[PDB]
Design a protein around this nucleic acid. Structure first.
Length: 191
RNA sequence: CGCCACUUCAUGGAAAUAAAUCACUCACGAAUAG
């Protein structure tokens, strides 16, 4: 499922082809070169995201995973993870503010985590900010016109529109959140 | 040299101002499925 209907964007094509919309205008919005992964921990919690392997977001993601995963010595903060989840709407507003997006992201990550212990994790914060901004830019480039035209479609049911319309900012936030949770899941031992 | 007192008895200003507003850790673990 992850390879077919998520990584290869076969949800979009299949859903449109079932209702016989398809057509060349929508086919040019089909996206490929994507990585999709899910992590089902022993409990039933799924961490599932998809990202483009074209562009700088993938290389920043790989460098972050190389950086903050301990070997067998940059330090990792675990409370940023719950900040991403809880403050997702605020991060969406900050990302959608185009003119001052980087400045607002830095100010938000500085005003939160504004304590003495957080001075040692400035590298993590700025890495997260840059990766999130890159992910949002690639997301908007890949999805904005697609979402706009899907919204205007006159035969699609609201359920299909909702499962097809991908929010550019929340998907980037979720990608960063899942990357951070994968880092924490690798790092933390039950000791 | 002798005689002798009456007065006046709080006003004006400052009446809180800045720093920190939660932080870190745990965000499921096993068993039952394969």
């Amino acid at each position: 499922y992850l390879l077919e209907m998520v990584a290869k964007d076969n949800l979009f094509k299949y859903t449109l082809s079932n209702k016989n919309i398809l057509n060349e205008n929508m086919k040019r919005f089909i996206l490929k070169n994507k990585l999709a992964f899910s992590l089902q921990k022993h409990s039933g919690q799924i961490y599932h995201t998809a990202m483009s392997k074209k562009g700088k977001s993938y290389v920043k993601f790989n460098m972050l995973l190389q950086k903050y995963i301990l070997k067998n010595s940059e330090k990792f903060l675990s409370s940023v993870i719950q900040m991403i989840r809880a403050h997702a709407e605020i991060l969406q507003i900050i990302l959608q503010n185009e003119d001052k997006r980087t400045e607002m992201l830095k100010n938000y990550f500085d005003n939160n985590f504004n304590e003495s212990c957080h001075l040692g994790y400035t590298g993590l914060f700025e890495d997260i900010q840059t990766l999130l901004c890159l992910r949002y830019q690639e997301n908007i480039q890949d999805y904005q016109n697609r979402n706009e035209i899907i919204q205007q479609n006159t035969i699609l049911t609201s359920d299909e529109k909702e499962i097809l319309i991908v929010s550019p900012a929340m998907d980037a936030i979720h990608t960063i959140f899942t990357a951070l949770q994968f880092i924490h899941f690798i790092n933390y031992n039950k000791d």
